[PDB]
Amino acid sequence: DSRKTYTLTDYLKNTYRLKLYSLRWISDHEYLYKQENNILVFNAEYGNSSVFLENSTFDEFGHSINDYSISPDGQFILLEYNYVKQWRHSYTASYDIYDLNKRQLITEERIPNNTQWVTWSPVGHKLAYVWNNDIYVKIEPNLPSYRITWTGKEDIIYNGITDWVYEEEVFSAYSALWWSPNGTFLAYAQFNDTEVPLIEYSFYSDESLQYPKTVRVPYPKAGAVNPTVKFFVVNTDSLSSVTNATSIQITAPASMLIGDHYLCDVTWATQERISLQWLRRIQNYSVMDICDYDESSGRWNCLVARQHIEMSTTGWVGRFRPSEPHFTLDGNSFYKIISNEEGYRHICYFQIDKKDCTFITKGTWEVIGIEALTSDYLYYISNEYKGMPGGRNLYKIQLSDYTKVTCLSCELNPERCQYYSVSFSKEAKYYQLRCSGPGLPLYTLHSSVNDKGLRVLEDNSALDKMLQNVQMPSKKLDFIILNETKFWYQMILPPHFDKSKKYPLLLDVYAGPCSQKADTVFRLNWATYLASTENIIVASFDGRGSGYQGDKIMHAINRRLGTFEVEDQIEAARQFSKMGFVDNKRIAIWGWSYGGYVTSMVLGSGSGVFKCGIAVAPVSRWEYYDSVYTERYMGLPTPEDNLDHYRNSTVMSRAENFKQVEYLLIHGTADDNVHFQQSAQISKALVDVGVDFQAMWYTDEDHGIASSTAHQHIYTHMSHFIKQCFSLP
Amino acid sequence: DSRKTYTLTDYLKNTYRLKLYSLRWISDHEYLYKQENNILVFNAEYGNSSVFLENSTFDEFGHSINDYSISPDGQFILLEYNYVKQWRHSYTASYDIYDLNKRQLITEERIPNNTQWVTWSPVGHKLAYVWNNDIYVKIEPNLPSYRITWTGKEDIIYNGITDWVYEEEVFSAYSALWWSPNGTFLAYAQFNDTEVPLIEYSFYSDESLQYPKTVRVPYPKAGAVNPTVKFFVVNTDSLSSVTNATSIQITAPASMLIGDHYLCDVTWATQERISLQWLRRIQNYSVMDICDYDESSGRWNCLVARQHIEMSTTGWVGRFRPSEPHFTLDGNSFYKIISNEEGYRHICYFQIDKKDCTFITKGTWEVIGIEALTSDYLYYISNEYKGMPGGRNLYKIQLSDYTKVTCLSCELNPERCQYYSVSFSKEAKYYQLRCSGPGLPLYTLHSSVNDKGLRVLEDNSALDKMLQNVQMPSKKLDFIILNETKFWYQMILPPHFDKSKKYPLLLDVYAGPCSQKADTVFRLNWATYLASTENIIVASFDGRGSGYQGDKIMHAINRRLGTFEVEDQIEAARQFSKMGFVDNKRIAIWGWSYGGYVTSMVLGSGSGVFKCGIAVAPVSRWEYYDSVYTERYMGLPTPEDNLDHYRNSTVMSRAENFKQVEYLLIHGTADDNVHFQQSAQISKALVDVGVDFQAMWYTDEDHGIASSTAHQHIYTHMSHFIKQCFSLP
């Protein structure tokens, strides 16, 4: 075989590039798609298109446009520019609105620079935005804004946007604004961080900055004072009739008000009914209130007969938070993913004023998400097919007959396609299927009326042809049985893999709660190079604490992070050794974030199994990580609750055992998420017991170490380290 | 040779210890000396002693005593405890006073906790102390304090103590208090840092600390707003319990008041006469005022006829600051080191009211310091002997006939002893000589009247016996000639050095202005180990910019840091690499502080001479370092002054040239001096150009990286790096 291999430069320079097909539904039968910087509009039924916005239109706009957003009535387009990233989801930007009918930029009453969030109403062309921590509404794009809040205050009061911890750990979004279905009402949350402590770190900036800047962020570490939250609804239709429209507060239930709590979900049911879910700071008790607008009082009332409790005796509520409800059109019932009596997550059907629900799916597999609901069908993704917890398919269940469940994707291309996601048009008339592996991604379009495939949108035939000239690695997905339970693993195997040889092995770890590192997804990544060019097996194992296999497995680490999930990676490496194609003297481990924590715990365990390892941006002590994530699994770090385990589960306490291994510790100095502090404390502990190790800081990089140069630098540095460890030239 | 070598553990565990003999003169004929934690008093003439304080005296004291200070009259001892270090010289502590006559600890009116500086008067037993940035005076140890100042304010107003930059770069001390010779008057400086910007950096502390602390220090970087200064004198004999004390201000001369300036020296001449030197912010102009008490007005007057101006056309004034004057007994004349008309620093004799001084020494060598003055002789250290700028000897010059100069140390033991310092008794009746090399240190006592050698105090004979058992390296000191000028170097050569073999070579560099790395001092350090155990030659070179050889050499880098001193280290290595016994494939370079900057500039030069190097806490860009040191050499970073060269002399601009060398970059995170920022910007520049390198941070370590565990860890890490570079096992 004289074909080239997949090299590090190939990875770092994106030589072999996956094509996507990212579309945006603007209706029940049209979508937008960018082609040669032109935005085209496509007809789903026939596949013909036209130019929606010529790629030259904003030549002489004077700025580079980052993104765009069409009003639901298609009368306007919002153009985003001057984009400046903040955390994982947050950023600020400038906005212009372009009038499509008269084909002209609107120059009057512009959205201000440094706007934090903007969203159209779901119907028409109203806008809500947040600027300097207060909410503003525009009824018409060219006309003046109406201010909604006056309490906004940098780092203290957040209206309509989340603070750091709610952005990262509860909403996975910066926005905390929710328009009603037809745009009459605007709901929002207000966060108060007044007594929340600040994480402080230096940012060095360009070489020209003489004094470093101190970045200061309200961030509650485990056990600290959390932000408090209030919820409001305003009637935007009243805005042009009164000077100052009233924001009506909906208070949390008494069972939440007795102590610390969170708002964790907001979902509109009808034009005059909203559901809110609340969670206790001890995250095993959740309450949903269903609240109706009282026209005679202008108030929002939440009948106790409509309140729904969710709790767990074995762990926390939800995979990472309570699931979202999907209401029927009349808003009198809803479907929601709930853990059943056997501990498997399945779809339950609720009437709003009845406490007991009815499970409509069951079995020893789980529903991943509900994707669409019509009058006749519910569409969901699950890992049922072939009992592979790491596969994903789309299913359809008849609402009048639950025995009628159809798999829409399972058999389309079963060899190539075992991991799907879906994108439905506005009334679920069409759907795009996206297949992520195990073969090359395939994107296809389907009609819901007959479930027939309309056409292939992207098939990655260009890449298929390129990769034919490369010695690519293969991937095995399989399981081992421990204590009568199947635990799944994957291996990236070198080309021409030969079972009678002994290969070096790298264990690639994450292993946080509900994680999944063994799956059917196709990836071109660092492991690809390591296997293809360096003949290293790269393996991953999903042990106790891992997700999508029921609560018996997921809740095994409840109140006990740093125990079974760590031990199970060690045992996985033992089991791989027993398979006979692994060089016992050359087994390494690596991970990022939680995977950095686990790597570090494994390297400090004294097991003798691992020669070396690499931790990137590790957690080292749970008291240094945020409250919402940490306490979900660990409870509170007090003598009365779980302080003893918090104190027993640190990396630093294992420092002496690092004498036995080669370690490389890496961290970005501007990491707002897992603070540089965490690695600073690992290194001090290692120095204090006289252990030699290797280190690398990345100036001004955050948790993703994702700038183009730093990305290339880190993988280059790590490659040298691994190769040296394994005596590879 | 079956003998052991000098190993890394020997260096780190201090297995081979130099003995010292630290005495404190308390009169013209007695000194104090600590023996077995007893404090003994010695008669200089006969060498008999008595116990002054038993080591058992404070057995039940209840705190460990950090240090002590006996009052000049022997009646009290000040006991220092609860020591907490601040910067290079600053610290706070608690103090108790023990009355030696009544053998009792004083319990009334005690010195407060967290005291910043304490000092006895020079005669008797008055005390002055600074607490909460204000000055207090006690006339008797058991009596209440008189508060002298009321303006003290943390980080803003400093009375009687220095701020960060005056401590490090001006006074080399935290105290800004100066008692008059008999204690009548107490002079002091006040610093005002109102508009000085703060450097901010994180401090992580013990693992128990949930949130990192931000340390904030008023520190003026090059070109930034500097502290301002005022000077005052108070009469301690006329203090009142009923009224606040009156401090008299002495203002700076008008030629200083015109712009930014510094107070740089304070020296009392008589009981009623004080000298002050001031320095312009452009540090090539200095003025001395001589001020006399006026008993009828109670004020201090400085006659313009007694003003003495000092300026430099080629550089800055003084080696690092204007030199201190040495007044005669009547205070009508003084001696001071000044650069002569050929640029060599020699002793000049001034009359207080005459502009012209008379040089009393001359030659192509320099006076290092003035050590004592009597009516007949002035005693000084110089590098005259054998024309060796890296040796030091004690001389006396007859004040009535300047042709009569006598070397007092040169011939005592010329083979062992070529580097001396001295400590004279109160009226120069006796002196202690301290020989530091090139043989083992030797401490001897002498009488001035006929320069008799009275006795050997400590000869290090025990260490000599031990060292005969180990294969110690040798040291060569010699010179190369670069266009017509001798430049000196030293090499630490392996045991059994064979000039027909080719050894690897490490260049140990500092090379700051007025530095000297080639000398006759005996050292037991990391180089000792590298030569003795690893057979590496460790060389050092003093090129342009170096000290003690005249201003033509020292001022060669005026306004041009990072040019000639860098070029000259490359040239030295180029020359060493041709000498016959050097392996030109294995030459390395390392340095700390200024030496880290030079190392980094050398590695970024593109010379091709060096395989690898190590930079510890380097300067990387002059705009990041403090105003007083930086501007002394570089002027101000403005377009009108020297900005272009500030911008041309960074490490970051040379990043691309690091592609052909191996570099290790090390910095402590709590470096208040050369901020971690400076290395953070180097790393980012190398990442940006795609250059791989090695790094190590030291959490919570400062510029010295001097904690016991961090010290051992750094030298261990550097040793592994150099051995790898040189292919040494």
Ligand SMILES: *[C@@H]1O[C@H](CO)[C@@H](O[C@@H]2O[C@H](CO)[C@@H](O[C@@H]3O[C@H](CO)[C@@H](O)[C@H](O)[C@@H]3O)[C@H](O)[C@H]2NC(C)=O)[C@H](O)[C@H]1NC(C)=O
């Ligand atoms: C965000 O939450 C903070 C509390 O964490 C609220 O701050 C508190 O506001 C109350 C009422 O305005 C303050 O009480 C007042 O104190 C003053 C004395 O200074 C007294 O004159 C008043 O009669 C009353 O007692 C309280 O000082 C303040 N507490 C803190 C810790 O700042 C704040 O109002 C919340 N903001 C919003 C928009 O919800």
Ligand SMILES: *[C@@H]1O[C@H](CO)[C@@H](O[C@@H]2O[C@H](CO)[C@@H](O[C@@H]3O[C@H](CO)[C@@H](O)[C@H](O)[C@@H]3O)[C@H](O)[C@H]2NC(C)=O)[C@H](O)[C@H]1NC(C)=O
């Ligand atoms: C330490 O130095 C600071 C900085 O120069 C001194 O503060 C300054 O003090 C003067 C005199 O009080 C202030 O002058 C005032 O100016 C304002 C204009 O803002 C004017 O309204 C008044 O007529 C007055 O003249 C000046 O503002 C002030 N600057 C500051 C604090 O930023 C301070 O007095 C010095 N402290 C000591 C103890 O020497």
Ligand SMILES: *[C@@H]1O[C@H](CO[C@H]2O[C@@H](C)[C@@H](O)[C@@H](O)[C@@H]2O)[C@@H](O[C@@H]2O[C@H](CO)[C@@H](O)[C@H](O)[C@H]2NC(C)=O)[C@H](O)[C@H]1NC(C)=O
């Ligand atoms: C050191 O000893 C001196 C006396 O020592 C005598 O020892 C002889 C061997 C010889 O060298 C002789 O010349 C020398 O004098 C102590 O001196 C004494 O000091 C006290 C003062 O408190 C007086 O009472 C004595 O008169 C005086 N003797 C003389 C004439 O000097 C001295 O105190 C002692 N010093 C120490 C620190 O122990």
Ligand SMILES: *[C@@H]1O[C@H](CO)[C@@H](O[C@@H]2O[C@H](CO)[C@@H](O)[C@H](O)[C@H]2NC(C)=O)[C@H](O)[C@H]1NC(C)=O
């Ligand atoms: C709109 O109404 C709100 C709520 O009443 C007003 O905000 C209050 O303003 C007063 C006076 O400044 C404060 O004391 C209250 O604390 C405010 N409450 C809130 C909820 O912010 C707001 O000022 C009104 N704006 C206008 C234009 O009248």
Ligand SMILES: *[C@@H]1O[C@H](CO)[C@@H](O[C@@H]2O[C@H](CO)[C@@H](O)[C@H](O)[C@H]2NC(C)=O)[C@H](O)[C@H]1NC(C)=O
């Ligand atoms: C969007 O829904 C809202 C709420 O139901 C509608 O506003 C109500 O309209 C009804 C008329 O059927 C009236 O009884 C009320 O006066 C309105 N109530 C409120 C809360 O304002 C609104 O008209 C709907 N919009 C559209 C376009 O149908």
Ligand SMILES: *[C@@H]1O[C@H](CO)[C@@H](O[C@@H]2O[C@H](CO)[C@@H](O)[C@H](O)[C@H]2NC(C)=O)[C@H](O)[C@H]1NC(C)=O
């Ligand atoms: C939510 O979790 C907490 C913490 O585990 C539970 O509180 C425990 O309650 C048990 C039984 O009532 C007590 O014996 C313990 O003292 C509590 N745990 C500790 C050690 O803090 C609570 O019961 C859980 N709630 C649900 C719904 O199961």
Ligand SMILES: *[C@@H]1O[C@H](CO)[C@@H](O[C@@H]2O[C@H](CO)[C@@H](O)[C@H](O)[C@H]2NC(C)=O)[C@H](O)[C@H]1NC(C)=O
């Ligand atoms: C000694 O001088 C200080 C001058 O400040 C006096 O102390 C202050 O008096 C002022 C009144 O002008 C108060 O506002 C302060 O609180 C006082 N002290 C401090 C801590 O600043 C003091 O009274 C003077 N004593 C005499 C005898 O004159």
Ligand SMILES: *[C@@H]1O[C@H](CO)[C@@H](O[C@@H]2O[C@H](CO)[C@@H](O)[C@H](O)[C@H]2NC(C)=O)[C@H](O)[C@H]1NC(C)=O
């Ligand atoms: C310390 O020196 C001071 C200053 O010369 C002496 O104080 C003077 O002494 C005479 C007494 O003979 C008085 O007439 C003067 O008024 C004093 N001057 C001042 C400024 O007070 C003093 O004698 C010396 N003190 C000691 C300890 O000897």
Ligand SMILES: *[C@@H]1O[C@H](CO)[C@@H](O[C@@H]2O[C@H](CO)[C@@H](O)[C@H](O)[C@H]2NC(C)=O)[C@H](O)[C@H]1NC(C)=O
């Ligand atoms: C102190 O140094 C400054 C800076 O080098 C000197 O100022 C320069 O002097 C020359 C000659 O007059 C001028 O041509 C330059 O333009 C001056 N300014 C600068 C910023 O370079 C000053 O002359 C020096 N003083 C002494 C005593 O020599």
Ligand SMILES: *[C@@H]1O[C@H](CO[C@H]2O[C@@H](C)[C@@H](O)[C@@H](O)[C@@H]2O)[C@@H](O)[C@H](O)[C@H]1NC(C)=O
């Ligand atoms: C897409 O084309 C539509 C034209 O309708 C006919 O197209 C023929 C090719 C055939 O498939 C017939 O069945 C169709 O009736 C037109 O109406 C749409 O406006 C076009 N859409 C876009 C976005 O270009």
Ligand SMILES: *[C@@H]1O[C@H](CO)[C@@H](O)[C@H](O)[C@H]1NC(C)=O
């Ligand atoms: C602009 O659009 C046209 C589509 O016909 C295409 O030829 C051209 O390459 C596009 N340019 C950009 C900016 O990609």
Ligand SMILES: *[C@@H]1O[C@H](CO)[C@@H](O)[C@H](O)[C@H]1NC(C)=O
């Ligand atoms: C946004 O900032 C730009 C650049 O300074 C300015 O010209 C423009 O007027 C600003 N836009 C708004 C809405 O204020």
Ligand SMILES: *[C@@H]1O[C@H](CO)[C@@H](O)[C@H](O)[C@H]1NC(C)=O
């Ligand atoms: C204390 O002092 C005695 C007196 O000579 C000395 O010999 C002894 O060894 C010392 N030991 C201590 C307590 O340091």
Ligand SMILES: *[C@@H]1O[C@H](CO)[C@@H](O)[C@H](O)[C@H]1NC(C)=O
């Ligand atoms: C110093 O602090 C200790 C402990 O609080 C206290 O007992 C002592 O009195 C303090 N000393 C003085 C002189 O203030």
